[PDB]
């Protein structure tokens, strides 16, 4: 009983073999029979070695969303989408199309020009910060409270230029 090898899953005392990618579960293995698995339709796919009974349907890249098909989806692999040309894929999951990425708060920019379709972001260096998501802006240096004021808390990358004050 228990433990169970990788590529096995265990159920009601028996150590059963998982279904290979591209095949769905139909019957749990017994003491005498191996796990009954069956393939997916070329609509459906299955990611991993599983005990899932329903195959997942393929992605679907809608051109009216700027998506095109990169890799054709197989019985063991989902359809991999890609964005048009002048645009990049809004995420790792090629789900939506953006003209270009936007460099989230703690980062600056190094610009987009395609097919270099993204904007190449830099983590803010020491003494610099960036608030807001911006497609063009760079990190900016902290304001020197010093000018008839005293620094009360500090900034750094995300946080707004050292808040303050006063004291001196």
């Amino acid at each position, epitope marked *: 009983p228990t433990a169970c090898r990788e590529k096995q899953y265990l159920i009601n005392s028996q150590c059963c073999s998982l279904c290979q990618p591209g095949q769905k579960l139909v019957s749990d293995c017994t003491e005498f029979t191996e796990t009954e698995c069956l393939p997916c339709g070329e609509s459906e796919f299955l990611d991993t070695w599983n005990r899932e009974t329903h195959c997942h349907q393929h992605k679907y890249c809608d051109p009216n*969303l700027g998506l095109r098909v990169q890799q054709k989806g197989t019985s063991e692999t989902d359809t991999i989408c890609t964005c048009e*040309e002048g645009w990049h894929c809004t995420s790792e999951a090629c789900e939506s199309c953006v003209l270009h990425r936007s460099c989230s708060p703690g980062f600056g920019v190094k610009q987009i020009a395609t097919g270099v379709s993204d904007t190449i972001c830099e983590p803010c260096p020491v003494g610099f910060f960036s608030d807001v998501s911006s497609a063009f802006e760079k990190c900016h240096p902290w304001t020197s409270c010093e000018t008839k004021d005293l620094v009360v808390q500090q900034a750094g990358t995300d946080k707004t230029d050292v808040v303050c004050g006063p004291q001196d």
Partner: nanobody, 117 residues
Framework: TEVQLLESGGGLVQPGGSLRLSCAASGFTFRDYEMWWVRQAPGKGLERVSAINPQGTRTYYADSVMGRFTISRDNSKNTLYLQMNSLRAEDTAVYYC?????????WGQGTLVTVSS
């Protein structure tokens, strides 16, 4: 898709000419979003022209248009602008205005710019 951007003030102009593109925005807090101007032409295929921050403090310009073109905005009028002066043949294109995510909803209908002689 409730975001609506309306391009205005395009046209044919002789080299050295001037034109002021107007992108009348509606359906979102315009005052909060960073904006862009992009041009598309057959062959010259898509070029990011200019960018402006929500406030109007910061702007970005492609080297090609620098000093001739000028991005601007009136947040109280909710309109985006492009003062394109000292115009050249290369600028002949269909110009579009953005909205920060930069998805399909986020785009203006475009306006055409042509120079000739």
């Amino acid at each position: 898709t409730e975001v609506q951007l309306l391009e205005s003030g395009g046209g044919l102009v002789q080299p050295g000419g001037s034109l002021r593109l107007s992108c009348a925005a509606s359906g979102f807090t315009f005052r909060d979003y960073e904006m862009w101007w992009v041009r598309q032409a057959p062959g010259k295929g898509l070029e990011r022209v200019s960018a402006i921050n929500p406030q109007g403090t910061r702007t970005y310009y492609a080297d090609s248009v620098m000093g001739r073109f000028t991005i601007s905005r009136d947040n109280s009028k909710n309109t985006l602008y492009l003062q394109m002066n000292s115009l050249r043949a290369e600028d002949t294109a269909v110009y579009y205005c953005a909205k920060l995510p930069f998805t399909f909803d986020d785009w203006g209908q475009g306006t055409l710019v042509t120079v000739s002689s």
